[PDB]
């Protein structure tokens, strides 16, 4: 219900999940940046009975940058959480590691930052 | 074939996961160390079609740390690769987020690094 | 000239730095937040021969949290960088590393994001 | 006495520190990979009184990747702490940032892990 729907980050891209009663969050992200081209596999789990004390329900999903028609050969995992009421957010830091050769393994890893609204 | 199996951690972490040829991470993770007691589902994204100039496999999974006995109210989410041969390994890093409050917010997310072997 | 002056991040923190022609970045840090109380010395590096591309200023920091009032057994370090203009902006990543046993050692260190402004 | 001394990381790198009765460190880094050649200046703060309950010594430091010969406009940041004893170890991990453009800001930070002993 909170977590279910269409999510925007800062620089454009669209997250559209469903969270199931289970932990598991199932959908698809469209990436608005880098060396990307229309839309993506997202699997992911949530905290599915969060703390009732005002706290964020912790959440994750991994994209792997390969459909039908490119391969980045590349995967983003995002960590965060779902801060629900009328302005609801999504929190989150993120790794990018892309598939390197042994003496290229200590440059693999980028680190960010992003924050989705249900806002276009 | 390669990433599918039962992978152990540096700090005693069992990882049993299967590969699928769509890119789908599914398993179970069995974590040696903090608040968390026994087995909790993991689900990921790896390239399916990885490079052929000795390049690792990028690969992503997400564990929220909720089973039937245990409620950590946090996710973590590991970004890496698969290097394949004699000494099959995934190198990873990691990000856990914690639930919180938006007073704790800035302290909600520890950073590490796991390395894991097909060895006991 | 460009980075020396008083900075203000996002959760009301003061940086007040001296850019030293030979890249030397000397001053105090004022944490808002955390186990912290008042002023602590800050030492880092920036590029004193940045790229003339409309590029940002790469740089550096580390604050040990220890003052003759506190001592909270960590230090953070900022890498990021100073993109200059009418709106000028130090754009950071953070590591927060506590001093712990090896038993804690995998929860040690806490990642962040700080945006820090000339306007309080 | 502990910290003060000449370090090698896992990839070949020596870093020569001095740790002031202040807590500063001061030294030279001089790095066996990535677009780098010969030495460079390092600045940063450590915990200079402890925890005497086994506990690890924070600290950490920055290079700006500028000297005389080379400039790759980026810094790194080292957080981490000094481990005491016959196996003395300093455990980081880093962030290097790259001097970009605001369209290129997204993949600024590269993320990773340095372990660093006393023998060469
Ligand atoms: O450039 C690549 O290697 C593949 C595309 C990566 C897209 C990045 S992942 C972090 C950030 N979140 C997004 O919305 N997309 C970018
Ligand atoms: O303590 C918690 O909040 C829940 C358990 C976290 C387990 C951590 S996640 C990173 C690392 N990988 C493991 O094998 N387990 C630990
Ligand atoms: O709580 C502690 O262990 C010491 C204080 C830490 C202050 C943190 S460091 C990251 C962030 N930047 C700030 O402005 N202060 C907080
Ligand atoms: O390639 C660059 O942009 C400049 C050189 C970076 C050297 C990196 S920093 C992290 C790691 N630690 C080292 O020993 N050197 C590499």
Redesign the interface.
């Given at each position: 219900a909170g977590i279910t729907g269409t999510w925007y980050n800062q620089?454009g891209s669209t997250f559209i999940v469903t969270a199931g009663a289970?932990?598991?969050?199932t959908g698809t992200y469209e990436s608005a940046?880098?060396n990307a081209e229309s839309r993506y596999?997202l699997?992911?789990?949530?905290?599915?009975?969060?703390?009732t004390?005002?706290?964020?329900?912790?959440?994750?999903?991994?994209?792997?940058?390969?459909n039908n028609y490119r391969?980045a050969?590349?995967?983003?995992?995002?960590?965060?959480?779902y801060?629900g009421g009328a302005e609801a957010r999504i929190?989150?830091?993120?790794?990018?590691?892309?598939?390197?050769?042994?003496a290229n393994?200590?440059?693999?890893?980028?680190?960010?930052?992003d924050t989705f609204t249900k806002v276009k």
């Amino acid at each position: 219900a909170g977590i279910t729907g269409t999510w925007y980050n800062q620089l454009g891209s669209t997250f559209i999940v469903t969270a199931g009663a289970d932990g598991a969050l199932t959908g698809t992200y469209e990436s608005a940046v880098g060396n990307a081209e229309s839309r993506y596999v997202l699997t992911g789990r949530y905290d599915s009975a969060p703390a009732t004390d005002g706290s964020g329900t912790a959440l994750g999903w991994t994209v792997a940058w390969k459909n039908n028609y490119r391969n980045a050969h590349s995967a983003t995992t995002w960590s965060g959480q779902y801060v629900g009421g009328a302005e609801a957010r999504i929190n989150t830091q993120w790794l990018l590691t892309s598939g390197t050769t042994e003496a290229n393994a200590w440059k693999s890893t980028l680190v960010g930052h992003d924050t989705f609204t249900k806002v276009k």
